[PDB]
Design an enzyme around this catalytic site. Structure first.
Site, mmCIF file in Angstrom:
data_model
loop_
_atom_site.group_PDB
_atom_site.id
_atom_site.type_symbol
_atom_site.label_atom_id
_atom_site.label_comp_id
_atom_site.label_asym_id
_atom_site.label_seq_id
_atom_site.Cartn_x
_atom_site.Cartn_y
_atom_site.Cartn_z
ATOM 1 N N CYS A 1 11.564 -1.243 -2.913
ATOM 2 C CA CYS A 1 11.052 -0.828 -4.212
ATOM 3 C C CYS A 1 12.136 -0.665 -5.340
ATOM 4 O O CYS A 1 11.775 -0.689 -6.549
ATOM 5 C CB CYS A 1 10.301 0.483 -4.119
ATOM 6 S SG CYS A 1 8.776 0.301 -3.210
ATOM 7 N N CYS B 1 11.695 5.515 -5.945
ATOM 8 C CA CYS B 1 11.860 5.781 -4.526
ATOM 9 C C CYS B 1 11.822 4.469 -3.754
ATOM 10 O O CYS B 1 11.149 3.514 -4.148
ATOM 11 C CB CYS B 1 10.770 6.725 -4.012
ATOM 12 S SG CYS B 1 9.110 6.014 -3.979
ATOM 13 N N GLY C 1 11.542 2.561 0.150
ATOM 14 C CA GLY C 1 11.153 2.695 1.540
ATOM 15 C C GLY C 1 12.358 2.688 2.461
ATOM 16 O O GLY C 1 13.402 2.108 2.156
HETATM 17 C C1 LIG Z 1 -4.181 2.544 -0.636
HETATM 18 C C2 LIG Z 1 -4.503 1.049 -0.546
HETATM 19 C C3 LIG Z 1 -4.619 0.661 0.929
HETATM 20 C C4 LIG Z 1 -5.828 0.759 -1.265
HETATM 21 O O1 LIG Z 1 -6.641 -0.114 -0.479
HETATM 22 P P1 LIG Z 1 -7.335 -1.215 -1.437
HETATM 23 O O2 LIG Z 1 -7.546 -2.404 -0.585
HETATM 24 O O3 LIG Z 1 -6.340 -1.671 -2.630
HETATM 25 O O4 LIG Z 1 -8.806 -0.708 -1.902
HETATM 26 P P2 LIG Z 1 -8.923 -0.199 -3.434
HETATM 27 O O5 LIG Z 1 -7.595 -0.029 -4.046
HETATM 28 O O6 LIG Z 1 -9.767 -1.286 -4.293
HETATM 29 O O7 LIG Z 1 -9.644 1.248 -3.518
HETATM 30 C C5 LIG Z 1 -10.868 1.199 -2.787
HETATM 31 C C6 LIG Z 1 -11.970 2.086 -3.405
HETATM 32 O O8 LIG Z 1 -11.413 3.169 -4.164
HETATM 33 C C7 LIG Z 1 -11.934 3.152 -5.527
HETATM 34 N N1 LIG Z 1 -10.875 3.547 -6.480
HETATM 35 C C8 LIG Z 1 -9.599 3.061 -6.418
HETATM 36 N N2 LIG Z 1 -8.880 3.547 -7.367
HETATM 37 C C9 LIG Z 1 -9.638 4.376 -8.114
HETATM 38 C C10 LIG Z 1 -9.335 5.131 -9.233
HETATM 39 N N3 LIG Z 1 -8.043 5.056 -9.705
HETATM 40 N N4 LIG Z 1 -10.294 5.872 -9.775
HETATM 41 C C11 LIG Z 1 -11.511 5.874 -9.240
HETATM 42 N N5 LIG Z 1 -11.840 5.167 -8.173
HETATM 43 C C12 LIG Z 1 -10.929 4.395 -7.567
HETATM 44 C C13 LIG Z 1 -12.301 1.656 -5.728
HETATM 45 O O9 LIG Z 1 -13.251 1.394 -6.772
HETATM 46 C C14 LIG Z 1 -12.888 1.267 -4.342
HETATM 47 O O10 LIG Z 1 -14.252 1.688 -4.254
HETATM 48 P P3 LIG Z 1 -15.029 0.778 -3.173
HETATM 49 O O11 LIG Z 1 -14.713 1.255 -1.811
HETATM 50 O O12 LIG Z 1 -16.613 0.956 -3.459
HETATM 51 O O13 LIG Z 1 -14.602 -0.778 -3.304
HETATM 52 C C15 LIG Z 1 -3.411 0.220 -1.244
HETATM 53 O O14 LIG Z 1 -3.559 0.380 -2.656
HETATM 54 C C16 LIG Z 1 -2.012 0.611 -0.826
HETATM 55 O O15 LIG Z 1 -1.560 0.236 0.229
HETATM 56 N N6 LIG Z 1 -1.241 1.368 -1.636
HETATM 57 C C17 LIG Z 1 0.112 1.740 -1.222
HETATM 58 C C18 LIG Z 1 1.150 0.761 -1.782
HETATM 59 C C19 LIG Z 1 2.537 1.192 -1.389
HETATM 60 O O16 LIG Z 1 2.709 1.920 -0.437
HETATM 61 N N7 LIG Z 1 3.595 0.763 -2.105
HETATM 62 C C20 LIG Z 1 4.954 1.169 -1.741
HETATM 63 C C21 LIG Z 1 5.225 2.596 -2.231
HETATM 64 S S1 LIG Z 1 6.953 3.048 -1.914
#
Ligand SMILES: CC(C)(COP(=O)(O)OP(=O)(O)OC[C@H]1O[C@@H](n2cnc3c(N)ncnc32)[C@H](O)[C@@H]1OP(=O)(O)O)[C@@H](O)C(=O)NCCC(=O)NCCS
Ligand SMILES: CC(C)(COP(=O)(O)OP(=O)(O)OC[C@H]1O[C@@H](n2cnc3c(N)ncnc32)[C@H](O)[C@@H]1OP(=O)(O)O)[C@@H](O)C(=O)NCCC(=O)NCCS
Ligand SMILES: CC(C)(COP(=O)(O)OP(=O)(O)OC[C@H]1O[C@@H](n2cnc3c(N)ncnc32)[C@H](O)[C@@H]1OP(=O)(O)O)[C@@H](O)C(=O)NCCC(=O)NCCS
Ligand SMILES: CC(C)(COP(=O)(O)OP(=O)(O)OC[C@H]1O[C@@H](n2cnc3c(N)ncnc32)[C@H](O)[C@@H]1OP(=O)(O)O)[C@@H](O)C(=O)NCCC(=O)NCCS
Ligand SMILES: [Cl-]
Ligand SMILES: [Cl-]
Lengths: 389, 387, 387, 386
Positions: A87, A375, A377
């Site tokens: 990151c 940050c 990983g």
């Molecule tokens: C958490 C994670 C698995 C999300 O899974 P995803 O496949 O992207 O699924 P979504 O992001 O579309 O969120 C799914 C649900 O939450 C809802 N939602 C997401 N964000 C929202 C928000 N900000 N406000 C309101 N609702 C929200 C979506 O509408 C969806 O509803 P649904 O189930 O009816 O489709 C993914 O975003 C992730 O891995 N994030 C971490 C990334 C990371 O770690 N980066 C490195 C950091 S060091």
């Protein structure tokens, strides 16, 4: 030696499998290389080297940094390479490009990051051969970017560990997530992202589409945010709403010495005063910015109160609240236009992405001292201090 | 800002799907990090950063450079990152680590490279979905390491283009390949590779690998009976071209004043380095302007060099670099080259730096040079001087 | 030995990656097996054997015909098996089930076909191991369903060979496809598909699918603006060729004396059947000798037929069959064909049998015939007579 | 309605990734189709239809049964199709071909089975697209051939339940396997398989190899094996059938047709039967299938002179023999699938070849062949010579 950032640019942050679903990272990187050259009045033939951070280059071919430089018009006599500090790759590449000029080995450097998490393929080692039994097709985005190699769980679980030690409730993390979505939506409406964003033309299908707006910026609420299920623990607080997403994009900056900018008549976006990178516990990798910013401020001779603007990457609401509570800087000067929770998180490019937001906000409001930090990983952090001229 | 190489080490270069067939790259890199710490008398807790070049990290997990540093005992407070400049990655990481200390940002750096071409998996982008029809499972070793992204052909075809411009015949390239195999075998028998090689224990019975698996020798009759592997009417064969290999190599970096305070006798002083680009069609010519710029920054002439390590990616490109630079061929790759030893992309830069440093010590050479050609049309060089 | 069709049913024909995108074939087959049992008043415990045609069973598990029978409530004491004669599988299984009762080996047979071209996976032989280089993930639908195994090209190229020999212009093939789309569109509105289609519950939410998804509206002007899909200088396009579809279809078979005791009035009596081979280059000519031999075994003439269902794999092949037999085109595919309704390979044989059987009942037809062309150069036909 | 088998032939049963490692199934099927025609003096142009059982045809192209017939010289005027009843596919295809001639729809039928478990690929449904996460590459041999679709476990677990309810000890399964291994080696050494096996020419880069011997034919080395399906089980790799490749077929015609051509048939198809059982104990399938076949033929168990009961597992094979009570000395006198091999699509016709050629040399009058079928089914057929 004084190294300045003559110009900077970035593409719009695309959604996962969204606008940049079938766009390789080097194509996004080529657009940003051409933009930082045009905005500074520097031709592609003057570039010595291109240094682009990238975490997921699998299947894209030999050295995608070289492919992005070639398509941007940088001549074959120059060099190009990629680097991976997860990151913090996008911001570290800027410091790496700065050191090329400080040691006298180069004059003009294009440094930043690019990432296409949508184009990340599934892989499997098949040279020995699977004589019998099922075998797994490994997602390179999850394996090489989002899963800790020492403890085996996702980066979201590390945010749960940070939430436990600081005792950050679900409602506090949702309040931070909603605040990020509302600041990013207000900044998008007022056009504060137009200076930093360069449009990208998505070729294909029957029509060409111009992408010049961050695709994740749509807003949110507090009633729909608390109705989400936790995505990493059955009894956890980190959800898909209060955590950053998977995104595509690129961001870079044009680097040269302070005397070189004066000779060209260029007004730099800022002066690189210092930088720092430090490691922490992989269990709480979100704490990386805490010692990284302190060392960056110590090398710059600055205090926390001297900062006028701060861009602290919002990988998770839990880790972002923890960094602010420890450093104690004014939260009203941190991510004034939103963060990665709302804008998006292309891992390799986010370091240079938040540097673009820092530089262009310091320019419009007249901020003198800024800091960007993220940050990393595996238990690391990276920070950089920027001062105006 | 004078930066010296306090110590260096490397693993034996393993064959493709050979001794290191199921060994991840960070496991090989961890052994070399521990070795350069032991040979210099420096504890792992004193390392500021680890910089490891690697071209094919797919499927190995988050930041293999951090995995190699952590398993080597480097504490979590330090940092680690990887970088990719293809074949020049191993040598550039040393120059990148040198700049960390030159700018005052670090004191102790472990820099080098590691590569496991055997563990490179097959990949395919499947998120959008394959609506109908067959799709290819892409070999990441071929696509991301051995295939030009601008013209679409293998790196061996680029050697064919160099052979046309320099008019290098089949028999001339085979004579260079046979000479490379015989020099490496003589150095292996005389034990000249033992100082630089650190043993690696293959866990599973435990096997200790301390000999280069490619070093076996060859002849001119079996070399001229091979078919060209890239063109039906070509001159580059599997014998006069480098192979696919696994291994790691690194070095411990610190300032010259820091080595004097610790009583360490360094292997050499980094005088200068350089990297330049060329046409991707003739990528093997990279070392020609890269070495010249490196010597210019050092204030040296080609005749001032006492030993030279120019990586042998192909006999065609290697002959062209020597003919253009004109240095004495008797001081170039005196213990063999990559044609016989092997070519782990990410580690080869630091691999030939190990061979240069330990040979400069045994024969007493004062000025040395290491250079490699880089895919996509680039080259990288570094000038080393003894103390 | 008189064998009758007591009842029949089929699911709606779904589009490629449409309503049945994630529905296995045996789940579709279970619904039609339960439906033909319910419509005839026959319990599942009386079924002796289930014969379901299927071309693409890869990845669905052991014997999908057994999975469909068990899930439909047929007890474990019965048997079930699948068979593959490509496009004629659905109709051949009905003839195969007829022979089971004629030889005295069974009394109650559920025979038909099922196909899920959307659930067809990509495969690759990986036991030997890929040492280096890319390998293809083979689409089993293209390889095992749409590609000729002797000449290597698609079934559309075989339609080009038939179109060249019969001198069929584009506009002539264009007019037949539009007529097929217009007859099928009228049948959907007129409710002629209500009797034969049994709804299927797609178990995000439960959705009831009871209408053919491929039925689309077309004209003669928008049809000639399409590009050829198999040859740059060809005449077969995506509009005048059958599509990629999912679905199932079956029928309940028993003797005429068995139906009289149960009070069941059958949809028709299986009078005769026939299968013959032709040149794989012109596989579309299959229905021509298959129907004639079927009529020969039945003792009928072409003029005696009241209704005809000739599968429309391609507009070129369908026009060729009509020109040879010379039957009245107004009694051929009165409710559309596979060009408009769809073409589930394994199920199409039993699919058009449902349309034939229920149309003979609605209009009072006495003598019917169903025929299809088979890839690799074969044909299958069956003669049906009312009671 | 009397249908006879004029001739029969089969290829050698190859080991998993052995002699037929890179040989498609239709290539093995082409050799046996040509062999049964040559041994009977019947031209390929007289064949009406070819019916070949096959369980794993993925990646082989359109209708491998048609591919095998075409290369074997059968002209395009004939037809060909495949069918899948798992392990009973090879024997059911013979019964299906018998019904083609009995109903008057054909005169000459080549019926049998073919299987290439080594060429079985790994598959995965990828049309919808894998948006996130790892996904499994499914072995089509295990999933579509060796995994129960109702309970999810391997076919070896079904043998454990037969061993559990019938109380078959570990030492009991080893005694059956050693007897099966010793009879197959004795038959191979004595040349008892030479009449039925037709050679297959394996072409290749470095050399052509002629394969005409069963490659799998091989208590001290037998009792040291670990159970392959359960830590507390009795089925091991030695007392269970293996993964194999091969083909087998037969030439079918009426008894009057054989008399007119001067062919002396290998036997007369007297009756056949198929019945279902519990999928948990699929090995009990042959028990009611053989009884139903004997009842339709008007025969009793004591009337049988030779019996071919497929040895999918030592546990399942012992259970059928103990209940039916037939003399074990007339069952698999030349070995079984434990030593010879178990090509799923071809095993039904494979054991039919051994029965026909052993009835001819020893003068047996009434024989029986039977196999157990996955998913809870069984198939049997009674053959008598004249
Ligand atoms: C958490 C994670 C698995 C999300 O899974 P995803 O496949 O992207 O699924 P979504 O992001 O579309 O969120 C799914 C649900 O939450 C809802 N939602 C997401 N964000 C929202 C928000 N900000 N406000 C309101 N609702 C929200 C979506 O509408 C969806 O509803 P649904 O189930 O009816 O489709 C993914 O975003 C992730 O891995 N994030 C971490 C990334 C990371 O770690 N980066 C490195 C950091 S060091
Ligand atoms: C050359 C290359 C294609 C070989 O691939 P390969 O298919 O594995 O060829 P092999 O290794 O099996 O060797 C082929 C034959 O030559 C023979 N051979 C190889 N080296 C020999 C030698 N030095 N002396 C005598 N015979 C030799 C081998 O024994 C083998 O015999 P075989 O026919 O029984 O296999 C591959 O190593 C390559 O691409 N190298 C270039 C990588 C590169 O681009 N490096 C530079 C990056 S800029
Ligand atoms: C011909 C074939 C390759 C089409 O592939 P396809 O690309 O998925 O066809 P599509 O419908 O998705 O696209 C066809 C185009 O023509 C138009 N079109 C297609 N059918 C039409 C119709 N019936 N009426 C009007 N317009 C039509 C579509 O709108 C589309 O235009 P677009 O690309 O701009 O969206 C496929 O249907 C096929 O394989 N057919 C043969 C199957 C077979 O061999 N069966 C066995 C025979 S024995
Ligand atoms: C029985 C089965 C589970 C064993 O497969 P396997 O475990 O992969 O056996 P292998 O292929 O590895 O044979 C090699 C091993 O067995 C040992 N071995 C094999 N045969 C042996 C023998 N006859 N005597 C002594 N040792 C033997 C080898 O030394 C080697 O040792 P290892 O177990 O440590 O690896 C497998 O053949 C199978 O799945 N059969 C399916 C049968 C079936 O279900 N049929 C359908 C029923 S209706
Ligand atoms: Cl220490
Ligand atoms: Cl130092």
């Amino acid at each position: 030696p004084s190294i300045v950032i003559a110009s900077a640019a970035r593409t719009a942050v695309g959604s996962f499998n969204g606008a940049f679903a079938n766009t390789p990272a080097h194509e996004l990187g080529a657009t940003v290389i051409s933009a930082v050259l045009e905005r500074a009045g520097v031709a592609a033939g003057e570039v010595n080297e291109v240094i682009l951070g990238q975490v997921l280059p699998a299947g894209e071919g030999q050295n995608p940094a070289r492919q992005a430089a070639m398509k941007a018009g940088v001549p074959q006599e120059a060099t190009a390479w990629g680097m991976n500090q997860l990151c913090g790759s996008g911001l570290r590449a800027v410091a790496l490009g700065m050191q090329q000029i400080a040691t006298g080995d180069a004059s003009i450097i294009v440094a930043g990051g690019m990432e296409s998490m949508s184009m990340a393929p599934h892989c499997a080692h098949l040279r020995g051969g699977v004589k019998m039994g099922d075998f797994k097709m490994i997602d390179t985005m999850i394996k090489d970017g989002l899963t800790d190699a020492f403890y085996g769980y996702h980066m979201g679980t590390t945010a749960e560990n940070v939430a436990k030690q600081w005792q950050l409730s679900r409602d506090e993390q949702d309040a931070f997530a909603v605040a990020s979505q509302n600041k990013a939506e207000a900044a998008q409406k007022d056009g504060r992202f137009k200076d930093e964003i360069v449009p990208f033309i998505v070729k294909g299908r029957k029509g060409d589409i111009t992408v010049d707006a961050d695709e994740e910026i749509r807003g949110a609420t507090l009633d729909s945010m608390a109705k989400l299920r936790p995505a990493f623990d059955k009894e956890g607080t980190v959800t898909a709403g209060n955590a950053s997403g998977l995104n595509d994009g690129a961001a870079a900056a044009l680097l040269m010495s302070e005397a070189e900018a004066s000779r060209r008549g260029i007004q730099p976006l800022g002066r690189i005063v210092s930088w720092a990178t430090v490691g922490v516990d992989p269990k709480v990798m979100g704490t990386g910015p805490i010692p990284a910013s302190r060392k960056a401020l110590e090398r710059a001779g600055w205090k926390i109160g001297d900062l006028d603007l701060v861009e602290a990457n919002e990988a998770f609401a839990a880790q972002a609240c923890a960094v602010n509570k420890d450093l104690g800087w004014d939260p009203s000067i941190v991510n004034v236009n939103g963060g990665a929770i709302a804008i998006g998180h292309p891992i390799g490019a986010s370091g240079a992405r938040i540097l673009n937001t820092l530089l262009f906000e310091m320019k419009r409001r007249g901020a003198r001292k800024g800091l960007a930090t993220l940050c990393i990983g595996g238990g690391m952090g990276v920070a950089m201090c920027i001062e105006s001229l």
